[PDB]
């Protein structure tokens, strides 16, 4: 897997170039925002069960056909598989957020996930809805705008990290 | 794998319905014919070697090219594999007869059997002929009409179980 | 689906052997016990709505705290979902009685149930209370025969043990 630094190095390696000043300054910005990034990852992981359960429950509430017989969330086995998949997707999204790069997510969760879901009959629209609710809740936790759970952090702007989390979730949605 | 009772349950679960009176009556009929079904399974398994060997021999005698060089029954290795695969088909047919449902047959024998035989070069028509001779011999043993074996059973009609065995063999033949 | 027939056939297939005397003997046991099994299943299918109502009422009576905000029964929607869950379990018990084994329950209501209930803040004690009430409410010979009662109470006890 790769991180932001590993991504910069891989990009530089393509041109046989030592890491340029612009890339070095970008990674210095990454480090200077590293405390904010750790804040964001802590906010996601400290509410991971909250995020996943809320997203799956909302996906079910908007689409009660998922829990109807023949639906993909009927059969507590399938329900637990759905909650597990939401937790796995959020875990790899948190990995990507911590790393600053989506390589871990794309290579270990999204790699072959679409065809796996198609073979299993997992509805891509419902999965995308669950991932989008996870995105909204995770972004709210990054920005500390969750109505029912506020995590104390020093005042600042983490819109870059919220946008990064949204980008990882959009990558998850586009992969399927 | 599913039996007749589990097949009824699965059909009822697709409707989120408790097992209806009609399905319960069908399963009660299955139970009332259970001794006949056990006798049918005993008839098949007590002559399984005879059934398989006779069917393979008839398939070869009708298609002597099978034991010719390049034929798929030439090479005692290939003959043993043919007898083994015929015995496996009869074993899964007997499983289906005992269970009253073809789920075990398809899932554990017929899933990918056509593709496997195509890859191996196993002739589909000769395999179908062997399966059909197994069908006729097994049907005769169910109805105790086998000219060279009379299983002592109480007098009655086992044509339903004979038709079930024929349907399982037809499912095997259509799978390949 | 875990049943007598499927268990014996799976064992024979794992050993790669034709059905033998023991397999037919087990199916004979299926035949003999099917009377009580299907009696219990038919009674449950015919009276499940009242049974489910009683089980849900007992569950919420023993645990009124479920109606508190932030708990599982904090709204009519999820109170109805509790009753629907009890109906799902009773339908799976009916399926188990029809099948002759815990197969339907194992695969559709028990597998992953622990993870779902932990993730959704559903205390297993509430399900256990509903099923215990259903088990102890059963009356012989008023509701069913003694052996049908044995099958029904065995399915309920299996669910309870899966939850506790």
């Amino acid at each position, epitope marked *: 897997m790769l991180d932001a630094f590993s991504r910069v190095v891989v990009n530089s390696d393509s041109k046989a170039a030592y890491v340029s000043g612009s890339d070095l300054q970008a990674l210095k910005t990454f480090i200077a925002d590293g405390n904010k990034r750790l804040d964001a990852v802590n906010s996601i992981v400290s509410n991971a069960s909250c995020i996943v359960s809320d997203a799956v429950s909302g996906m079910i509430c908007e689409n009660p*056909g998922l829990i*109807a017989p023949g639906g993909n969330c009927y059969t507590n086995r399938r329900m637990a598989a759905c909650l597990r998949d939401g937790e796995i997707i959020l875990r790899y999204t948190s990995y990507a957020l911590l790393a600053g790069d989506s390589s871990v997510l794309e290579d270990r969760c999204l790699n072959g996930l679409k065809e796996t879901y198609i073979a299993l009959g997992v509805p891509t629209n419902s999965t995308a809805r669950a991932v989008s609710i996870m995105k909204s809740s995770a972004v709210a936790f990054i920005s500390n705008t969750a109505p029912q759970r506020k995590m104390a952090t020093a005042a600042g702007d983490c819109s870059a990290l919220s946008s990064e989390v949204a980008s990882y979730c959009d990558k998850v949605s586009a992969a399927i | 794998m599913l039996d007749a009772f589990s097949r009824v349950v699965v059909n009822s679960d697709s409707k989120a319905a408790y097992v209806s009176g009609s399905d319960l009556q069908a399963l009660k009929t299955f139970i009332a014919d259970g001794n006949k079904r056990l006798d049918a399974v005993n008839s098949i398994v007590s002559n399984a070697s005879c059934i398989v060997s006779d069917a393979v021999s008839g398939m070869i005698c009708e298609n002597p090219g099978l034991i010719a060089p390049g034929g798929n029954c030439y090479t005692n290795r290939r003959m043993a594999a043919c007898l083994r695969d015929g015995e496996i088909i009869l074993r899964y047919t007997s499983y289906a007869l005992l269970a009253g449902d073809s789920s075990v047959l398809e899932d554990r024998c017929l899933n990918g059997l056509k593709e496997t035989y195509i890859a191996l070069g196993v002739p589909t028509n000769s395999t179908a002929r062997a399966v059909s001779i197994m069908k006729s011999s097994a049907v005769a043993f169910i109805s105790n009409t086998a000219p060279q074996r009379k299983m002592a059973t109480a007098a009655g009609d086992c044509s339903a179980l004979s038709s079930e065995v024929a349907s399982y063999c037809d499912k095997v033949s259509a799978a390949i | 689906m875990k049943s007598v027939i499927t268990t014996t056939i799976s064992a024979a297939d794992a050993a790669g052997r034709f059905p033998s005397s023991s397999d037919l003997e087990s199916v004979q046991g299926n035949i003999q016990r099917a009377a009580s099994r299907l009696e219990a299943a038919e009674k449950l299918a015919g009276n499940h709505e009242a049974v489910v109502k009683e089980a849900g009422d007992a569950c919420f009576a023993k645990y009124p705290y479920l109606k508190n905000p932030g708990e599982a029964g904090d709204s*009519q929607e999820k109170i*109805n*979902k509790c*009753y*629907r869950d009890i109906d799902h379990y009773m339908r799976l018990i009916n399926y188990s009685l029809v099948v002759g084994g815990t197969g339907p329950l194992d695969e559709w209501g028990i597998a992953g149930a622990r993870e779902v209930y932990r993730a959704l803040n559903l205390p297993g004690s509430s399900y256990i209370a509903a099923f215990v009430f259903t088990r102890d409410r059963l009356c012989v010979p008023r509701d069913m025969s003694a052996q049908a009662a044995v099958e029904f109470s065995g399915a309920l006890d299996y669910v309870i043990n899966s939850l506790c």
Partner: T-cell receptor
Amino acid sequence: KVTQAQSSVSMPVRKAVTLNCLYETSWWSYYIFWYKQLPSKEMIFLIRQGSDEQNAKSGRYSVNFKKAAKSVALTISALQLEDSAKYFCALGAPHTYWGISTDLSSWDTRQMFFGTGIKLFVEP
Amino acid sequence: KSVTRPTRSSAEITCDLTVINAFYIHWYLHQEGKAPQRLLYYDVSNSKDVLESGLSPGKYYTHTPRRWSWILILRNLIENDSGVYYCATWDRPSKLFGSGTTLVVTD
């Protein structure tokens, strides 16, 4: 089925009027909705009252629900001048999964049964 | 808000439901003297029309002009078909309703 027996009720401004709607049902759990149809015919949701909930309240709007009598008559209080419309007692079971017919429908296909409505005139 | 169409013609009932995650769209007719009643609901995912019992197929069709957009089609209009039509989808607390269009069928 919904039965709003009385229509065209009249009540002055800054007053309270109770719109008596009944219903027939075979549903164990259900909800009762109260809609006012504006002169623009914009059906507007006012209050939601379920079969297994305490009598609903939405500030000005309130419900006096009954289970055995099936009287879920909405009560409006402190009427404003712009409160006159055609008020509909709507019986549906949207967020209900148990206690209805054995159809394979996921309650998103379920129809909202309406009463013939009661027009309210807010006299000054 | 109004649609006037001759008898034995076709009426297009658009509405303003901006619901994105809709799965079913119900079409209610208020004939201004009776209760608002459903003719059918549109299965949005599978694109099916479910006419209520006793009706005849080919009377009501739900058209999808865009993504999240619906229109009720009325073949061989008659005067009884006149009324007010709503597209209704269930929301979390209630059933959301469009602004409602009035279909008057003139000779």
